[PDB]
Amino acid sequence: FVNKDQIAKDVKQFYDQALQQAVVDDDANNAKAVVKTFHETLDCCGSSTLTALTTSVLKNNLCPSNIISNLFKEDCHQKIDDLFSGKH
Amino acid sequence: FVNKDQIAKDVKQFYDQALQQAVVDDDANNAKAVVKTFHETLDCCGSSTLTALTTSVLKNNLCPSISNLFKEDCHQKIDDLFSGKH
């Protein structure tokens, strides 16, 4: 079978890459779109591993209808785990 | 970095194996949970590449609350997630 924990880590990896690129890049329009998609789908805002960048993402209107922390309760890494572990 | 394609393939494949386990394996508790979690989250039911079993999983109440299963392809929902439309 497909390796569970490796796929969950790849998706976090991928999300992190988008989240960073959303703020640091010369407007990666897709990176911003992707990052909204995740937040809405997972009811989510940022990462605990990227709490500096998550702040500015929050204020750029890429999170579900909340202000700063909060944030530590809105970790996407944890919602990604829960998706692959059959919770929610 | 990680490529969008290979990760989007992996996740479909992970789901597909959950969809199968939920039906063919008897006790498969986690497989059912995983399957419903995906359906609830992504808003979809089953897969085009598993249309027969999807019939069963719809009928086991593991989907959101039959003719229109083709419109609820849950593989597409996964692509939309990683591409950024959803």
Epitope: - | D16, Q17, V23, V24, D26, L53, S56
Partner: antibody
Framework: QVQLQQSGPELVKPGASVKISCKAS????????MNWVKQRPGKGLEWIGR????????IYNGKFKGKATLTADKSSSTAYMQLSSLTSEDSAVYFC?????????????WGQGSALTVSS | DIVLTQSPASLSVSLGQRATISCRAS??????????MHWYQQKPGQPPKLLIK???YLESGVPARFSGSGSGTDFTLNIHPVEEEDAATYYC?????????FGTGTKLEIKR
């Protein structure tokens, strides 16, 4: 003990209809699928379709789509199968078989069959 | 539709001996984790009985002398050692997609 007792043999005139029946016991009919398979004398097995007893939703083999008609009856715990415009080569034994508790997609318990023979 | 070509059409096998039937699918019947091919036995005048499920798994209450193997399009069924009660027609069936279809059929004769 799971058993599926089927309707007796039947002689019917060409161009008529027959409603064969398959009564289920010893398992929860209401949330189970029931399949139907055709077998002509001295020949193989042909799958007709399967119906979900909980709400009568049925998936037909394209070959039997407009001819076969599956229906479920929870109270009786009975699946029915109806064939229109009967022809000499609808003569055959017709089986019913249940799937597992999930939708196994596998024919786990079979009735004895029903000998339908079409002749004027 | 998936076309199941069983072979041989029939075979005669002495008691105590091995009998191998094969089934070949027109396209693949396997996913990453499951081969959706099953074997049925039909004694005349009776309904068929499921013997092997998902290529290799013994349906409960079936002698271990029945075994199955294969993947993709190529599937084999082995009975060993053959017995009198194994006189029947053997059918392979896929459940990969709609419509379900059955194999051409293989008739086992028991040499005594």
């Amino acid at each position: 003990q799971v058993q599926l007792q089927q309707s007796g043999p039947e002689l019917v005139k060409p161009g008529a209809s027959v409603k064969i029946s398959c009564k289920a016991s010893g398992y929860t009919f209401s949330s189970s699928w029931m399949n139907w398979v055709k077998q002509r004398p001295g020949k193989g097995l042909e799958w007709i379709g399967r119906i979900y007893s909980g709400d009568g939703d049925a998936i037909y083999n394209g070959k039997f789509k407009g001819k076969a008609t599956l229906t479920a009856d929870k109270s009786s715990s009975t699946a029915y199968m109806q064939l229109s415009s009967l022809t000499s080569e609808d003569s055959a034994v017709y089986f019913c078989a249940r799937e597992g508790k999930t939708g196994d997609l596998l024919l786990r318990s079979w009735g004895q069959g029903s000998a339908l023979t079409v002749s004027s | 539709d998936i076309v199941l070509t069983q072979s041989p059409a029939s075979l005669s096998v002495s008691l105590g001996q091995r009998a191998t039937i094969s089934c070949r699918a027109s396209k693949s019947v396997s996913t990453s984790i499951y081969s959706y091919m099953h074997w049925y036995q039909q004694k005349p005048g009776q309904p068929p009985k499921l013997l092997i499920k998902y290529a290799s798994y013994l349906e409960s209450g079936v002698p271990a002398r029945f075994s199955g193997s294969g993947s993709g399009t190529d599937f084999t069924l082995n009975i060993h050692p053959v017995e009198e009660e194994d006189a029947a027609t053997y059918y392979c069936e896929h459940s990969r997609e709609f419509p379900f279809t059955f194999g051409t059929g293989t008739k086992l004769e028991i040499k005594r």
